[PDB]
Structure 1
């Protein structure tokens, strides 16, 4: 329950190959022209589905 040998740099980086984070799922608001998340209310013009919220 305690490491027998220290971990080399190659093995550490190989383990960290999957420890990234993905890219946000966004597109452009039709009214704004600005970026926003899909299926969300855009924070700039405060509209969703062509109607003001």
Structure 2
């Protein structure tokens, strides 16, 4: 339950191939014309589907 050999820089870098994080699924609001997440209420112009919640 204890490592036998130390991990090289190659193997320590190969394992982190999948330790990245994805790009957010943003979009563009029609009214305020700035970036926004899909299916979410627009934070600044404070509206959704053009209703001004």
The bucket for the TM-score relative to the shorter chain is: over 0.9
Q: Which runs of 5+ in 2 are unaligned?
A: none
* Number of corresponding residues: 53
Higher relative strand content: 1
Shift of 1:7: 0.1
| 4+ aligned runs moved over 2 Å, structure 1 | none
Q: Matched residue of 1:17: which SS?
A: helix
Counterpart CA distance in 1 for 2:17 and 2:32 is 37
Counterpart CA distance in 2 for 1:21 and 1:34 is 23
Q: Matched residue of 1:40: which SS?
A: coil
Q: Matched residue of 1:48: which SS?
A: coil
Q: Which runs of 5+ in 1 are unaligned?
A: none
Query: Please, what is the CA RMSD of the aligned residues?
Result: 0.5
